[PDB]
Amino acid sequence: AYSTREILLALCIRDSRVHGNGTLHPVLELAARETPLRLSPEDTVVLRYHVLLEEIIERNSETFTETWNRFITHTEHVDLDFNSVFLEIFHRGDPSLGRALAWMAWCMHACRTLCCNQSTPYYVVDLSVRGMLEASEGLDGWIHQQGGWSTLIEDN
C-alpha cells in the first residue's frame, strides 16, 4: 500500500509539475530522496487525487487563502503547528473521507503557495514540508481501516 506521506509528497510534486514553470523546489526533491518516494507522481492514483484536491481547493479558495495566510503569518514554528491543526481535526474529532480530503487539499494548497513564491525562505519551505508530511502520517491507520488511498476514490 501507499503511505499518506508518499501520496501527499507525490501530489505536491505532481502539482509542482503542472504549475508555474514546472520546476521543483529543492526541499521537495530532497524529500523525495529521503522518504524515499517510491510512488510516481505520474501514477494514475496521483493523477486522480490531484484533480480532486484542486477541485476542493477551488470550491474553497477564499477559505484556503485566508486560513493559510493567517497560519503562516502568525506561526513561530510552522512544523509544530501543522501537527497541532491536524490534531484538532483528527484526534479531537473523528476522521472521515471529507475531513481527510480537506486536510490533503489544504496541505497541497499550502505547498503550492509557498513554492510558487520565490521570495519564500528555504527554511520555511523546509519546515512546512516536514510538518505537513509528519502530521499526515496520522491518517494511515484510519485510511487503512478504509482500504487504502487507492480504494477510497476509485471504487465509488
Binding site: 477559505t63 486560513t67 493567517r70 503547528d81 491543526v85 484538532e88 474529532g93 473521507l97 480537506a102 489544504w106
Partner: peptide, 18 residues
Amino acid sequence: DIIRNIARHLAQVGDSMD
C-alpha cells in the same frame, strides 16, 4: 485561537463534503 479556528474551518469543509 488561530490554530483552533483554522482547524474548525477545515473541519467544516470536510463535513460539508459528507
